[model samples]
Target chain A: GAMNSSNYAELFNNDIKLFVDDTNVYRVTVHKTFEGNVATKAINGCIFTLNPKTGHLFLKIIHTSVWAGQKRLSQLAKWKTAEEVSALVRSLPKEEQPKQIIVTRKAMLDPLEVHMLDFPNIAIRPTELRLPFSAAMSIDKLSDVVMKATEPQMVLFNIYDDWLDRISSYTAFSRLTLLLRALKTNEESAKMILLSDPTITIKSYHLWPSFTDEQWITIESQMRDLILTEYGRKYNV
Target chain B: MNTVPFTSAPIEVTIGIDQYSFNVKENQPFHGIKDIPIGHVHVIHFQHADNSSMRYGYWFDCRMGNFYIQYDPKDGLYKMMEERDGAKFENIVHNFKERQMMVSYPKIDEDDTWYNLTEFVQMDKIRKIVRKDENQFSYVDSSMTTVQENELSDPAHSLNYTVINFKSREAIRPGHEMEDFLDKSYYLNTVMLQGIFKNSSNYFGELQFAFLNAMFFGNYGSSLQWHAMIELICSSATVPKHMLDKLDEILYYQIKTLPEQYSDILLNERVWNICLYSSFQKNSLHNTEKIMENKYPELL
Candidate 1:
């Protein structure tokens, strides 16, 4: 089914409005090389940054020099660890620094791993995207595509299910605390939003052992206390 | 015999016909036997005779599961040490179950230690007395149990054993239990945190992204959070009040002094250091105490 052009505009306008209103927020999405396209062989992981306010987008592909002869795109793409990525972002001009950045990837990033980036001002947000077209498009064209999108295509019915799975399998409490500091306050409110989302949950019991009511309350309380004590004082709140 | 002073020097143990010499530390448990036919009389001879005591037992790795065969000098036989006997031997067996045994060879590599465990089959007990070849070796019997090989293969059992060992060691307050738990947590958190940053362009941005994902989505903020929760549940249910209290005190000291110990890396300032700090922070008595109060309200 195709989205009507007017409908697509409305969706894009609302989505773009989110970042445009918050000067601190920026969206970071990655594109990989299209399979079976050899003539324009490109790096596996190409990063794009979107400025919601200006509707401007920046594109940076890992220097081909970094992985020219490497056989595997995955290996070549891994040339830069998260630290290197953070450093690259840091090296950008001050005007380019975003306080809140969103990442779109096929895989989930561990919250604790993101904390390990140790940036001075930036907070990382993770999202998922499955592009209908090649990522090799120029920044201008990709921006056009993103702006015209009627709905942010999601691969899962409930993204939180995957998030919970990743967290339970990989994260630690302190890291969780740091992550909570970065997001909006009122975790209980967030929990309600998650459960209420039609795409995510049909029943409260689906959360099971991971998001039991008791556990969620305790986690939210602990997180709230830690953030208030740590970030609040650090920022002179 | 007087107890020998702990030394780094290699120690030897002779089992059955062969004498295997390996480097053995004071508290380290060494693997002396591997796959062997059942019913053969196996005797263990510690190079330091004083090291041989009821504390030393044969860990029988079998298809049916694992068993601890304790040596009885009076009976001149090693018998299956049943869990139902009492808490003393039970603790030892519990520890052995959770603990991985070490493998080392003095003649092969003096400085190296290899960790290993083995599984074996049934053998009839030796009815005839076998003469010792210079080294006085106590006979070890490996054939007492009729337990099926698959009886103890439950993964849950291993997890439970780990919890039990943690609780039992916490009660003793030798400091090893807490240290082991922290070390394991530290290693896992470090590996995971490093992996997360492996592809990022800025630490701050990526961290914010992760944090936001965790909070807004109900995902884990860090690996330490869920780990601590699991540990707290197990500990609260099984650990005695005194032991839990002692653990709380130990955790407090550890967290308090972590900054000094990690002076090379500042807390919350660097990702690597923060990852390390998270391990200690999650294991803090304050957090554990809160978790216990919330999860098991009546217990307190």
Candidate 2:
């Protein structure tokens, strides 16, 4: 009942559902952040999870690309004029142009907007999106990515079921759970937003960040102590 | 009524609540790509003599992604547009699904040219700087399909990948000359590369250590290798002035005569892109500000 060897999943509060992307290849693996103690680890942005042995957290800033309900505006989308919108749809090579370029605006003064133009080019497909629940080559890199991981944003994905193969074989994880600090996103995860096809998936999220680097330091300290206790309890030291 | 002969963005009938024509109306400027509908927004297969349907594309930002030697009428003062004050474009086709529009830029050109310009550098950062891998320095000219991405290791797709595998260490084993055999670094190439990168001493080193290290070795590399170095040489404030002239002498001359020297390569996209990028300077769309003529987007 304490922490069952069979039911390790019971200890964790959040569960990341798992499934194979169309590619059936693991592009990345993200671990759940310790709640109450650790903040959300995966902030909405692209992550560079390779090489944690070097001990560096790398994130590329995802710029804001939102278009609704914004009293405050910086990094907000610009408005296109009615003339600009027409000239644009008409410019498409006759065949590829939309059947009807939808047009509207938030308010009368707001820049006139058109549908389809706001979407990414259709050919930019994510039919083969992979989450790389990547196996860590080194201990530091493994924990490094875990500490910076975000909640899995896949339609059907879970940490346990997804890696049944690896977890079944690797008993090393049954011992002391090491430290990790999954970063939370300011908005929706961009890994899927930037690449997924609209025909397959169309999503939008606030590009603005919810947390800053300075905010991450506090969570890391808490995680650092929790991991120490984990190690101490295991060794009975 | 007849009008004087002049060239401008092709004007067309625009419709609003009432049909109104665009006039000399001015307004405030914001940030985005202005050529909302066009500019390196699509891909095309060239009819190369090799019969290679190799996909090629220009960046959506190619139109105004450079410096203009413009006569500024505003102040009669020469000003390169503020690099940071990036203009905005009401995206025309970034939304791929609702419209499912794929643009065709058959005649458009490509360039491997690099600039230290901030907009592009940040653009690269915003999308990502993929690292922590065997081959982290990646650049795809055209957006790839799911199949191509999955089978990147496949024989056909592998050709698309340009790997510069490095095998290092002392050669003490029997057939040592063939290769260095010693205390093997498990993915040590990356480990060692990672260590050196992690040990950087300064700011730019921290920012570009991996990118810089990726290029350091082709010390054997990709043809895409030379172009990046050229930018470093040309843009680096520390690059010796004398070296610049020598580089220009060799490279600038190629701009004039190399097109013919590499006439056979016109058919080889791999080589031709390097040629064109090295030879070409302006964006594929010469003046992105103006509506391109004959250049049309074909839905995929």
Candidate 3:
């Protein structure tokens, strides 16, 4: 058998692993590490599927011990397995299977790695796309990036990560307002489903001096009103 | 919790020449035993053409020496169970027979509303007395014996209590219509008000909850609890006069503006808005308020 390093190199580059079953079904395991920013654990095993045919994306968020343990700071791990990934992949339709699986790995010591393997019959290669946004990104640029990145069927917002704190900042708040407006005003963007953890609460510890409890509350209500008004009950807020 | 019959004698009622006799049960008890305006009277049960039975009773106002008939669907009767003098009894029965006008229990155009009795007579005199006093109120509408041809012919006339624009010509069963009307009216007037008040303010929240608990759970006599609570709350000096006025305005506006079909939806939205307003109150902060006022001027 000929050895092809590029087959595995793709996954290694993206920090993901692939397993191909005998039936030609491919299971992509996405590895996510919390590093010091444990808040990412909220979306650790989250799986997002993009249907190239219809340009619709389906996201499934998995709640695991690592996700729950992130806030408590107990029984922490650098990288956690996608324990439910196999079942999730199996549940997806055959036509909707990905040509390449991108796994996000958050390793404490080792650099991020992605591994890829070929599945029979599927010729399309999964494109390596990074989520384009930074803490310092401007609202206009963020909006442009989101609109250009993908036509999302659903987007899961990680509320555990000082999301409210970020929104509380004057700059961040303005940017979010712009982003929300852009998403809401456009028919295509308005159709995108927005999801968040209903259980997440705004704690004082999660906020900074830039945003007070009152400001945070106001921002929350405003955000809710904005989403509801813009989307017209189309998206889950 | 006291339950005593208004009368021990069998009472007979005639509607459009169809007369039915109600035999008072030996131990069957009626509500409002403590403060029954009239002395303990008799319970009369009559059957409609549909074979459905309804109870009616007579009441004697000891203080005023006036006779009254109480017909509450909640009491499963058409007459109030209180004693009446012979002359007053004859007058009530005569008025009841004369008022045997056919009107819908609730306007027929409304989807959820129904008319209980097709040929049921109304106790017009008793209803007039009840309506005269705000403290003495009943949910039951008095039946009208004479309906003017023009009144029935005019569509706008349906706005009046005695007229109904029935969608169907089929006769309505007596007790069934009463039961349905009672259920819907109870939910709308009492439970719905309680829900609205529960979400409105803290002071009224407990009051609404207490009233609901007593009305539904405890042996609170009379469906008039709806009127009594509203009166008490409205009369209380401690309650903000503006809020009470605003509540009335809101209710009136909804009733006047919304169509019969949209009543339920209108009520739900009103309740939601009330809760939303309450949330805004709790979430109000000095800086937030200023910012919100500046940003959304129309909202403030």
Candidate 4:
């Protein structure tokens, strides 16, 4: 169970390398906040991009403001009323409609309520991310966490980089940094939350941490110690 | 003095309901279609020549779903009226079903020229209305169905009788076809009719037909196929116990029976049987659940 810093580095290197080689992957920088705190501390934040295809993540955010904004907009815009809205949109000049609008009522509402209607549609296609960790998340579980992440903060790094390296395919450069915050309950596990609170609890607590950059390093180090204590220094070999 | 003589046979001018007794003149036209009764409600189908333009019209029993035009096509005055009547009928059916009934109509007229009429009525009012030939055949334009008994008095069954035409038309984009894939699937058993009703998102209205083309893409397409089936079953008075049983099984499992279950003949049979059986019972949001609950009343 004990993993030395070298082993962790090796794992990280292998994981990051997979995405680094991909050209189509877009590396985006999204700022996340937690409890009105900007989490601007260099040591406190992380960065990453998204693989637009499956919408998997490279780095993740843990916050509330952005997520709630998107969700509120999705509902208000009646995104699921895409056909209706799209029909209305068709009346507008061709240039007026966004190139790719989210079709679901919730998705459409999320942007409208969140004022993301003006958000630029940066083209990023077919991106992917392969994690180094054991498949610790299911698609539903992952989506739940992302949707409910609380306390706005930033994720730094390119998920596409990790993806391209894994697939060994070359594509164009695209960035998919989206700033998201948790909507209501920052808890790690809950599908739907009361309207008053507007948040769900999550079970994968450790998956998303409000750790500062330094804190993350320290936490990983601490994990090493816990593993070493459980096994032994020789086991580190 | 002889030239001053004026014709004085009191020219009769019929108004309102009495206007039907006279034949249509070259300039003055009236409802022309035949066999349309006074109180019988018929689902009027409207379509243009291209078939791309289609509308569902509901003919009011009193005002037949027809417009009179002069035998000499030159009298264009009635032409506008005929076209207007057709347009009005389309609006009524689409609006009534989409907004009023909150159910979907999938079938549309082909060639955009011909439309089929189906009957939908209030079950309770059937006895009172049907007993009178005038009311039975007279087109009742209103969405209201007569309710004579509380047994079928629910809003779902407000119309004593419901008729569905597999051939209905809708205004679709050029090159787009009006297809009720579910109707096709029902016969093919590619998917079970009962499951489609249970899972379709637009079970209640216009989406029943328009959704077919709108959502047609990839493997999970065919909104009309699924959604229309839902409305048909939901508004239908007939549904079988076994259909409810199969639906109960699906509902309990929360499984979507479409492409995933498309190839499973046993499951397909189960769904088909369920759909067939469902034709005998009333449809509702709680249709399957309610039906199952009735069959197994002691379970609760």
Candidate 5:
């Protein structure tokens, strides 16, 4: 293929290999113009690609209401390959993959909320982005707020490396500590503290009635330990 | 330090016109002159040796009522003496017949007469008296009244009455010096902490490290310096318990099911320990009393 421009001729001929590692990656391109001025235009749809093998990701502008989705959609169509893009479709841990993709054909005339069909592996779960505070309502409410604000069109098991790398340095806990001190209460403090570490497990018995003896032991033990140690009196430990 | 002598006549006029002019006669030649009460205060003014200007003072008047006249050598004695009639005889003359006059002008001949008599007031009998305002008889002169006002307004001239004017607590109040000093100290501390925060990554989990590193310095006597420096640095560097709770919540709900990589049971314990240790240290070091004393003494 002829090089697109003089500036890209060298890079195009190099056949370069890229690695993303654990860092989150993001690539943005103006896809289309829908309403108002160019700056305030709504994105018609986008095709976000993730290279799980190297964690490299690229966001390509696909279809638009203003510009006929010709050039950008064609560019995205060229990158779609069965083998090269299969790793992005894999489930978390890449072992227990989900069965069967259920594609629903919505009315084409309607304004698109999310274009799940733009990528083969990426799904649209439409889950609320709101997060909860402690074992309470606030964290879930906050997550909903985030979901409403972001309105993510695609869902991937893991975010790309470049995106993760940039945001991971931010300490939500340090910021919350300032807010907690202003409120000055143990309950509020505990809530904010619990929200900062997102990887902790919470166990509920009613939700899993068919639990085995070992499962019961594990769940009960974890719950009891969290309550007793963290909420306990000695050293206020 | 140099004392020049002037002789007005062969017969000495021991009655000297001091810096103050007064008829100071000691023992009267006539016994009937006794019990004639004399004023104890007189006013005289003189020019200083160094400056071209003149100064005024109160003098004891032994010849009249206990009243003293306001005198300015700039407009009084110097003017009067310069224009006295037969002033060419105004030159100071001296005689060595066991007689001497303290003031002598070099312009006049030694034989010049300045009105002398055997029964005249002797200059040797006159003396300069130091006046005190504390004594009821010691009156303040009208001319020196303006001196008090000038000294009060001028800082340099006011040094003489510093003991009296600045005697009370309200007089020496700290206006801007203390405030400016505190402001400098506070900003220094804040900037130092901010610098540390900007550079520090390893100590993100250990906030006390940042707090300890910050320091405020060098604004002359500003209250804001200390108040803002200590508070802002401490607030920025201190981590509280709620932050840990939020971290826990994020971990809890984010995962649909536990994966092989998940070791929540162990990770929770580690996080719990960090939180507890941090809490213990925070409470231990709070020392609100000491902090308030140095930072907020206005309350005390």
Candidate 6:
């Protein structure tokens, strides 16, 4: 709840709110004035967990808003919802309404991690952490590279930020412009820009067909544990 | 304008020690001691104001072979100066005739004892003396430039010479002159754009947006920054085509699909979530998919 209140301020600058439930299920929703108080909307940005039963942890991963998943995960972390969290995705797009989450079978297990500055001595090895084949690949690849760094946190930031830089510049032709100028440095860099067209589109390209709400919330819990032992820090939209 | 004094007074000094002083002031061959008899040409010898010594030309082949001749006032009349060990075309030098060697230079006080003159003659300036292509056997330090009228012109084109450019370390600015900090120029909208992305992190507390400023600044950033932009804006932007051209050009091999970024497309619910947690447990989920939220959110 502290993270919910503290972190919620900076997000959307205030367009949205994070509601992380501890006991009450139905009593959680609130009608917060948002969007500059111009329009008060439902907590349509739902970041709730399904009451998981028969699991090692009670509040394991469950249905979450795709758009709000990361917020929910981050907010709920500090480790609480530990139930038999089975992965399930529920798209929150008003148009899509809800897509039946057919991609349920955990194709593979990735050694997903939850590291925090607070809990430096603590760790978890979820060899059975369920992620799609592609998602697992992504996590493993990123994790391996990050952990290999002198400082995983900085390395993690660098790796993700590097990817995002290219991704963000996708709006301007500058991404390619930047890459080519970089290509002048060597062919090793050139391969990345090869035969690439910006016009094409794919679903995985945005965010991998990853994140079952279960997975997000699980990460949130793990993430929160780190914070629980570690330190502190927030903003407005 | 750069200014310096011009020397004019006739200097009276024996040949060798006063090489530049040997440049005769008069062209009409003043009454000298006698003929500096070379094989064919005659050397013009100028008498000192007090007739202390006769200054023969700079370099001359006299009765002696290839030595600057001198007539001293110290009893011995004729004297020969020692030859230079080596003479290099150290000035603005270049390629010339078939296989010959020669030199032409504007001798200044740095090399010439212009201070050793009798009076301040205006001749102590940049006097242009030129030898024809590889033509310097006469030992001719005779006239001050052209003891004549002079000839030259141009249609007003451009300077044939060039000033130095592209200094690696040199900086141009006054010490007190200050740069307008608030008013800055950048390749990208760095201040506003960087602030926008960074602020998004503050607002959302999402690292992806936190990553925005760094991403766009990197050589390998586009996909990273744009991806964040899309994810965030889905809650924002398109790339241009010509930009792709540059990326393609940079590609050592012609690959139609990029290895990663551009190669993939928008994620489906499944792929999207996978990318979401892997990327965002760190915000791609809502940000990337936030597009359809408004694009097709007729219900809202």
DockQ of 4: 0.03
- Report iRMS values in order: 13.8, 27.2, 33.1, 15.9, 34.8, 21.5
Error of 6 at A170 (Å): 54
Q: Write the per-residue lDDT of candidate 4 for residues B36-96, one digit (tens) a residue.
A: 3344333332222222222212223334323322222242111112334566655544443
Q: Please give, for residues A78-191, the per-residue lDDT of candidate 1 as tens digits.
A: 223333344445566866565555444422133212422445345544433222112223223333444454432211112123333434312322233233332344434434
Could you report the DockQ of all the candidates, in the order they appear?
Answer: 0.02, 0.01, 0.01, 0.03, 0.01, 0.01
The segments of candidate 1 whose C-alpha lies over 4 angstroms from its true place after superposition are A1-45, A78-84, A92-96, A108-116, A128-237, B1-300
| Residue A91 C-alpha lDDT in model 1 | 69
lDDT of each: 0.32, 0.25, 0.30, 0.28, 0.26, 0.24
Report the lDDT of model 3 for residue A87: 38
lDDT of 5 by residue, A99-176 (tens): 222111121101111221233243322112111111211233322322343333333322222323333212222222
Q: What tens digits encode model 2's per-residue C-alpha lDDT throughout B117-202? A: 11113323312322212221222222232222343233222212212122212112222211211122222223322343232122
Q: Rank the candidates by lDDT, best first.
A: 1, 3, 4, 5, 2, 6
Kindly give the number of clashing pairs for every candidate: 42, 47, 31, 108, 82, 84
How many Å off is the CA of B296 in candidate 5? Answer: 33
Candidates sorted on TM-score, descending: 4, 1, 3, 2, 6, 5
Provide the lowest-lDDT 10-residue window in model 2 chain B.
B12-21
- Pick out the ten consecutive residues of candidate 4 chain B with the lowest summed lDDT: B1-10
Candidate 2 local Cα displacement, residue B196, angstroms = 19
Q: Assess candidate 6 and give its lDDT.
A: 0.24
Give the distance in Å from residue A155's predicted Cα in candidate 5 to where it truly belongs: 45
Scored by lDDT, the top model is 1
